[PDB]
Amino acid sequence: MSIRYESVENLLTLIKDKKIKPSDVVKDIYDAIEETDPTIKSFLALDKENAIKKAQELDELQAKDQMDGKLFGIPMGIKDNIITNGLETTCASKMLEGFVPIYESTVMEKLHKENAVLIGKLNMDEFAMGGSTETSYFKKTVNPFDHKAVPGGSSGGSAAAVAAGLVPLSLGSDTGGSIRQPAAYCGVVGMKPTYGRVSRFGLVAFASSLDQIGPLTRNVKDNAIVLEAISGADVNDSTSAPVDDVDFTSEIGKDIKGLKVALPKEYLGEGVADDVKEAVQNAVETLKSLGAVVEEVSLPNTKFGIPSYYVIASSEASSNLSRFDGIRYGYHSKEAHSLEELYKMSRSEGFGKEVKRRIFLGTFALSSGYYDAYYKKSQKVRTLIKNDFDKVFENYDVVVGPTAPTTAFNLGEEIDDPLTMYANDLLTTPVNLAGLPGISVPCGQSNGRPIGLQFIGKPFDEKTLYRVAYQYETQYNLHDVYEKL
Amino acid sequence: KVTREEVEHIANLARLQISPEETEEMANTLESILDFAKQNDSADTEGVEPTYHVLDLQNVLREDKAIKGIPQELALKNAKETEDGQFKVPTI
Amino acid sequence: ETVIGLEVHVELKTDSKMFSPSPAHFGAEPNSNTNVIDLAYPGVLPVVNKRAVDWAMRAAMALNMEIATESKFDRKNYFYPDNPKAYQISQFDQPIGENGYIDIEVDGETKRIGITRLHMEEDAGKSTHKGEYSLVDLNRQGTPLIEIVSEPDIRSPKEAYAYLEKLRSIIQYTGVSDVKMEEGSLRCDANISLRPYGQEKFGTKAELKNLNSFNYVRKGLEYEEKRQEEELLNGGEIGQETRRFDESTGKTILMRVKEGSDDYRYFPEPDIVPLYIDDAWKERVRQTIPELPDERKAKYVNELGLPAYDAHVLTLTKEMSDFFESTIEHGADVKLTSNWLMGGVNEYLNKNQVELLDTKLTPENLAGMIKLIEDGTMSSKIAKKVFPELAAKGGNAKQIMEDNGLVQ
Ligand SMILES: NC(=O)CC[C@H](N)C(=O)O
Ligand SMILES: [Mg+2]
């Protein structure tokens, strides 16, 4: 619980310079969790036994000076959304409680090859549906900056674990903003890379055309390091992009003089709180002092992000969650006699309330007579939303704005009011809709709760995003705050 | 609108058990949400093509090379009801 | 007028499954031929079979269909134990093949049966209804299938039988499937509606199921449903909609009272990138279609001077047709070759359950035996004793009536 606040970059040099051994590292990580997570509640299944075993292997490799891997000895937490072979993966649902995968997801395969150490699975909204992680069937993760505030969702555990110094790196998933929004609320860095940048094989599906795995870290550099490790074409995922260049750090450090940054007027609309709005405006000035050209633009179809996103994602979800029937795995109802009952009871009992809402919405949107007016219509709106970005990207290198309309809200404050919960996705969904990469870094605090600054880039231009985010991070960050909590 | 009938129709389509009470609750939610969805009417989509895939990527195919399946044991591992190396389900 | 339309499914002889690397050929042990993709495990993804696509377009072209340039897959949503994903990956809006046609002979006339589409999809698993429960085996789940839906141009169970007989033959020649209803690699569903000549022709429909074999059932289905369709025309029946066929009793038991019409909520499969079938691709595949039966029979009769009956028998399978064409171009007499193929050789394949290609005779040795006959150095008698062995292990015939004691 001593290197527990060290960055990935620095923790690696310590291990390489033999200032500490992989086993001591792992010991520190678990002392932290046992001492801190009973309050934060960011982890679900822990993999301590296996973690120590792996750490032993690494000590030997350290001694024999054969420390290979971009993340040798580095601890990692993974959203229980991402399949981990042999380790319970629940998507924080009763439906998958006790589920032990018999295969490995591509990101884990890649992370294990880089010699990172699996510490455990992180809490999330059930089946990744939510914005506060409160729908979790197991426990309610809390915000490290204020234990009464939500950590965001659906990757609340991923952001909280990193913000509370339990691991220097975590993996989350982002379908409508589930990496960026939690990163914003918990004051950390979260990148949802370009759709197609990271394999979806092994990612329990929410919305296939929108889902994307990404890293959360306490700083920009580490984040780029984790991304390089998980990106890449994958034969197991036909939609993974055949883009060879996965170098995201080579541009980190270079200035942004003349960088053309677009500030969409809609990203500072009426739905955006004054403190958030004020914080992003100051951030804009910080960008100008670094030499960037920040100018206002328009992304006219912004207002349609939430509605179309919810129709499309629920529709896809209504089909992607249909495999859960309790017949081959997961929750199987007992008091079921009829086949119709096996399906209906296993699903109504295994799925939480929000999941069922999404399924009802999606099933309806795709049903006869409603298909064109809802689903197809929303698919057309998605085109418009993507068009907004292409027009803006003809003259600007990057887009900036707030990550979320507000700071983290309270536990219990919006969990019983869906439309209010959804509104928090105002500034994140357009990015998934357009298939673009988006990163969030902290740019201030209000009442102690962090505010996120979002940088949206061109497809496969995460390097530029990391370049501008780092520059901004030199001017303002929360690196020295996490340790205080 | 959103009637108890539609709600029940949807319930059956998504294979979800819905009680004669959660129906009136799912109805209000389904109405509130769908109404909230009608904001898209303001979106000028006339003549615009729908987006099915955000990433232009063509013909990603797999060579027809078979890979032996996993042991029957593995295939049944996570299932609750199994018999004769097969999944056991009611007969309807 | 009796308007019928057939709905056929063909199993592709690929090595692996449609959207999974699993073997398309399984053993007897249930759930022994699966992987996490066939088991619809959470997080898995489909990976399309390259060969299945080529074969699908090959069959489509052999059926003279217009091939799509842009073609994607769609999810056909529906719950059922043999469909683990709760959806079959198929093709809705952009089938790989459209508007083809097949010509057949009926009452001495040439009738053209249009074919609406040929699309790709995957097969379901099998549920053995046994006891108070059903046991599900997913070894077959995911196997490649192409659905071939005929236009409603056939007018009688006579033509319909001829339709699927021509169809079966053409697909067998493409090499993409064995298409044997007996083995399941070929299936068919009918759609019949009666109504007086000169109408909107809307005599409703009659999606009847359980048709299991050409000569068999489906060949007698129509005899019955029209029958009923007519005897019930003196009332204007509830039209009825879908009825199963009872074998022995043999007739349409109007099985289910529709709920309305199953909503599959079809939508483009986001997990599979669209196919863009370029001209070079089409041509490449187009070039793999061999010479079809009709063309070959015409030549055999008009060019080789073979009897029409012989031409028909010899082209029932591409393999025998090829063997015949090679054997003769090897010097052997045309008629004698036809006789040995239709006779001795065929007798062999039957009383031995073996494909002509698995045996050991070759167009060369057979041509060699045929020459030893039309020369006289071997009587039809010795020929009957030599052929058997020549088939199994042979190589030289004027070496067996030697390596044996049956000489010239
Ligand atoms: N999974 C995340 O990307 C969440 C998206 C959105 N907040 C929801 O509940 O769908
Ligand atoms: Mg079909």
Residue A370, burial from CB neighbour count under 10 angstroms (0-12, 13-18, 19+): middle
Residue C214's nearest CA partner among C257, C185, C193 is C185
3-state SS string for C121-181: EECCCEEEECCCEEEEECCCCCCEEEEEEECCCECCHHHHHHHHHHHHHHHHHHCCCCCCH
Chain C contact for A235 (CB, 8 A cutoff): yes
Is the CB of residue A363 less than 8 Å from the CB of residue A375?
Answer: no
The reply to whether A154 belongs to the active site is yes
The residues near A49 (Cβ < 8 Å, ≥ 6 apart) are none
3-state SS string for A38-105: HHHCCEEEECHHHHHHHHHHHHHHHHCCCCCCCCCCCEEEEECCECECCECCCCCCHHHCCCCCCCCC
* Residue B15 to residue A347, Cβ atoms within 8 A: yes
- Residue A222's H or E segment, with its range, is helix A220-230
Ligand 1: residue of A123, A127, A154 to mutate (most ligand atoms within 8 A of CB) is A154
- Residue A444's H or E segment, with its range, is strand A438-446
Catalytic, out of A7, A93, A158, A178? A178
Alpha-carbon distance of B46 to A381, in angstroms, equals 10
Does any ligand 1 atom lie closer than 6 A to the CB of residue A174?
A: yes
* Residue B66 to residue C15, Cβ atoms within 8 A: yes
Record the tokens describing residue A237, joined without a space.
């995922």
End-to-end Cα distance, chain A: 14
Q: What angle do CA C62, C4, C143 make, to 5 degrees?
A: 50
Determine the residue among C39, C44, C71, C89 to mutate to test chain B binding: the one whose Cβ has the most chain B Cβ atoms within 10 Å. C39
* Residue B34 to residue A361, Cβ atoms within 8 A: yes
Which one of the ligands is nearest to A428 CA?
Answer: 1
The residues near A201 (Cβ < 8 Å, ≥ 6 apart) are A105, A106, A234, A236, A237, A240, C43, C44, C45
Does any ligand 1 atom lie closer than 6 A to the CB of residue A226?
A: no
Amino acid at site C157? P
Give Cα separations from C207 to A100, A243, C218 (angstroms). Answer: 44, 49, 12
Based on its alpha-carbon atoms, the radius of gyration of chain C, rounded to whole angstroms, reads 25
Give Cα separations from C318 to C73, C174, C302, C333, C355 (angstroms). Answer: 32, 9, 19, 20, 12
Chain C contact for A327 (CB, 8 A cutoff): yes
* Residue B53 to residue A379, Cβ atoms within 8 A: no
Is the CB of residue A190 less than 8 Å from the CB of residue A442?
Answer: no
Give me the residue label for tokens 């670094």.
A290
- Minimal CA separation from A368 to chain C, in Å: 7
Catalytic, out of A154, A199, A231, A240? A154
Which one of the ligands is nearest to A150 CA?
Answer: 1
- Minimal CA separation from C33 to chain A, in Å: 15
The residues near A394 (Cβ < 8 Å, ≥ 6 apart) are none
Determine the residue among A324, A328, A344 to mutate to test chain C binding: the one whose Cβ has the most chain C Cβ atoms within 10 Å. A328
* Residue B51 to residue A304, Cβ atoms within 8 A: no
* Residue B16 to residue A356, Cβ atoms within 8 A: yes
| Residues of chain A positioned with their CB less than 8 A from the CB of B69 | none
Record the tokens describing residue C345, joined without a space.
């050789």
Alpha-carbon distance of A481 to A145, in angstroms, equals 10
Is the CB of residue A364 less than 8 Å from the CB of residue A109?
Answer: no
Give Cα separations from B1 to A26, A371, B18, B27, B55 (angstroms). Answer: 57, 17, 19, 9, 37
Pairing of the two strands C207-209 and C242-246: parallel
Pairing of the two strands C66-67 and C97-106: antiparallel
Nearest CA to ligand 1 atom 9: A130
Alpha-carbon distance of A465 to A44, in angstroms, equals 32
**Sheet of B86-90, strands arranged across:** B82-83, B86-90, C133-137, C126-129
Residue of C nearest to B55 (CA): C273
The SS3 of residue A30 is: helix
The residues near A163 (Cβ < 8 Å, ≥ 6 apart) are A143, A144, A145, A151, A186, A187, A188, A218, A482
The SS3 of residue C109 is: strand
How many Cβ atoms are within 10 Å of C85's Cβ, its own excluded?
24
The SS3 of residue C260 is: coil
Alpha-carbon distance of A403 to A142, in angstroms, equals 19
Report the CATH architecture of B1-44: Orthogonal Bundle (1.10)
Is the CB of residue A147 less than 8 Å from the CB of residue A39?
Answer: yes
Alpha-carbon distance of A286 to A277, in angstroms, equals 14
Longest alpha-carbon distance in chain B: 58
Beta bridge partners of C117: C98, C149
Side-chain half-sphere CA neighbours of C311 within 13 A:
17
Longest alpha-carbon distance in chain A: 69
Give Cα separations from C388 to A227, C51, C331, C338, C347 (angstroms). Answer: 68, 37, 21, 17, 10
* Residue C267 to residue A204, Cβ atoms within 8 A: no
Pairing of the two strands A449-456 and A398-402: antiparallel
Record the tokens describing residue A421, joined without a space.
């919960």
A403 Cα: distance to centroid of ligand 2 (angstroms): 46
| Residues of chain C positioned with their CB less than 8 A from the CB of A369 | none
Alpha-carbon distance of A428 to A179, in angstroms, equals 9
Alpha-carbon distance of A251 to A230, in angstroms, equals 18
Residue A165: which CATH number?
3.90.1300.10
| Residues of chain A positioned with their CB less than 8 A from the CB of C41 | 101-103, 328-329
Q: Where are the beta strands (DSSP E) in A181-285?
A: 189-192, 213-217, 260-264
Please tell me which of the candidates B29, B36, B57 has its beta carbon nearest to residue A241: B57
Beta bridge partners of C113: C102
Which one of the ligands is nearest to A317 CA?
Answer: 1
Q: What angle do CA A92, A96, A98 make, to 5 degrees?
A: 100
Q: Cα-flanking dihedrals φ and ψ of residue A173, to 5°?
A: -130, 150
Record the tokens describing residue C333, joined without a space.
């007499």
Sequential DSSP letters for A419-437: HHHHGGGTTTHHHHHHT--
Is the CB of residue B55 less than 8 Å from the CB of residue A435?
Answer: yes
| Residues of chain A positioned with their CB less than 8 A from the CB of B42 | 303-304
Sequential DSSP letters for A280-306: HHHHHHHHHHTT-EEEEE--TTGGGHH
The residues near A115 (Cβ < 8 Å, ≥ 6 apart) are A58, A61, A67, A68, A69, A71, A72, A73, A74
Alpha-carbon distance of C315 to C311, in angstroms, equals 6
Does any ligand 1 atom lie closer than 6 A to the CB of residue A346?
A: no
Please tell me which of the candidates B13, B17, B34 has its beta carbon nearest to residue A345: B17
| Residues of chain A positioned with their CB less than 8 A from the CB of C40 | 323, 328
- Shortest-distance atom of ligand 1 to CA A177: 3
The SS3 of residue A219 is: coil
Is the CB of residue A188 less than 8 Å from the CB of residue A442?
Answer: yes
Chain B contact for A94 (CB, 8 A cutoff): no
Sequential DSSP letters for C329-387: TTT--HHHHHHHIIIIIHHHHHTTT--TTTSS--HHHHHHHHHHHTTSSS-HHHHHHHH
The SS3 of residue A405 is: coil
Residue A345, burial from CB neighbour count under 10 angstroms (0-12, 13-18, 19+): buried
Chain A contact for C392 (CB, 8 A cutoff): no
Residue A175's nearest CA partner among A138, A201, A212, A147 is A212
Catalytic, out of A79, A110, A192, A463? A79
- Residue A252 is given by DSSP the state B
Record the tokens describing residue C293, joined without a space.
């039966």
Ligand 1: residue of A306, A425, A426 to mutate (most ligand atoms within 8 A of CB) is A425
The residues near A275 (Cβ < 8 Å, ≥ 6 apart) are A407, A444, A446, A447, A451
A208 Cα: distance to centroid of ligand 1 (angstroms): 13
Residue C188's nearest CA partner among C227, C220, C214, C162 is C214
Does any ligand 1 atom lie closer than 6 A to the CB of residue A313?
A: yes
How many Cβ atoms are within 10 Å of C41's Cβ, its own excluded?
24
End-to-end Cα distance, chain B: 34
How many Cβ atoms are within 10 Å of A439's Cβ, its own excluded?
31
Nearest CA to ligand 1 atom 5: A176
Alpha-carbon distance of A128 to A130, in angstroms, equals 6
Asked, as a colleague might, if the bond just before C321 is cis with ω within 30 of 0, I would say: no
Structural domain of residue A215, as residue ranges? 1-485
Amino acid at site C29? E
Is the CB of residue C147 less than 8 Å from the CB of residue C119?
Answer: yes
Which one of the ligands is nearest to A432 CA?
Answer: 1
Amino acid at site C167? L
The SS3 of residue C115 is: strand
- Residue B69 is given by DSSP the state P
Alpha-carbon distance of A212 to A171, in angstroms, equals 11
Record the tokens describing residue A453, joined without a space.
């600054």
Chain B contact for C33 (CB, 8 A cutoff): yes
Is the CB of residue C391 less than 8 Å from the CB of residue C375?
Answer: no
Chain A contact for B4 (CB, 8 A cutoff): no
Residue C89's nearest CA partner among A379, B59, B65, A320 is A320
Alpha-carbon distance of C142 to A314, in angstroms, equals 26
* Residue A310 to residue B62, Cβ atoms within 8 A: no
Chain B contact for C32 (CB, 8 A cutoff): yes
How many Cβ atoms are within 10 Å of A23's Cβ, its own excluded?
18
Give me the residue label for tokens 């004698």.
C336
Residues 23-62 of B with CB under 8 A from A: 26, 29-30, 32-34, 36-40, 42-45, 48-55, 57, 60, 62
| Residues of chain B positioned with their CB less than 8 A from the CB of A308 | 40, 43
- Contacting partners of chain A (3+ CB pairs under 8 A): B, C
Alpha-carbon distance of A399 to A390, in angstroms, equals 11
Chain C contact for A236 (CB, 8 A cutoff): yes
Record the tokens describing residue C380, joined without a space.
């039809």
Does any ligand 1 atom lie closer than 6 A to the CB of residue A154?
A: yes
Q: Cα-flanking dihedrals φ and ψ of residue B13, to 5°?
A: -65, -40
Q: How do the domains of chain B map onto residue ranges?
A: 1-44, 45-92
Is the CB of residue A272 less than 8 Å from the CB of residue A402?
Answer: yes
Produce one character per residue of A451-477: b if its CB has 16 or more CB atoms within 10 Å, e if not. bbbbbbbbbbbbbbbbbbbbbbbeebb
Q: Cα-flanking dihedrals φ and ψ of residue A220, to 5°?
A: -65, -45
Report long-range pairs for C73-76 (Cβ below 8 Å, ≥24 apart): C73/C48, C73/C120, C73/C268, C73/C269, C73/C272, C74/C266, C74/C267, C74/C268, C74/C269, C75/A319, C75/C265, C75/C266, C75/C267, C75/C269, C76/C121, C76/C264, C76/C266
Beta bridge partners of C150: C115
The reply to whether A178 belongs to the active site is yes
Give Cα separations from A181 to A175, A301, C97, C178 (angstroms). Answer: 11, 20, 46, 55
The reply to whether A79 belongs to the active site is yes
The residues near C381 (Cβ < 8 Å, ≥ 6 apart) are none
Chain C contact for A338 (CB, 8 A cutoff): no
Is the CB of residue A226 less than 8 Å from the CB of residue A172?
Answer: no
Beta bridge partners of A264: A297
The SS3 of residue A441 is: strand
The residues near A432 (Cβ < 8 Å, ≥ 6 apart) are A174, A175, A176, A177, A192, A195, A210, A212, A309
Give Cα separations from A416 to A130, A412, B75 (angstroms). Answer: 12, 7, 40
3-state SS string for C192-257: EECCCCCCCCCCCCCEEECCCCCCCCHHHHHHHHHHHHHHCCCCCCCCCCEEEEECCCCEEEEEEC
List the resolution, Å. Answer: 2.3
Alpha-carbon distance of A168 to A182, in angstroms, equals 16
Is the CB of residue C14 less than 8 Å from the CB of residue C51?
Answer: yes
Residue C59's nearest CA partner among C160, C158, C178, C141 is C178
Is the CB of residue C390 less than 8 Å from the CB of residue C373?
Answer: no
Longest alpha-carbon distance in chain C: 78
Ligand 1: residue of A181, A204, A409 to mutate (most ligand atoms within 8 A of CB) is A181
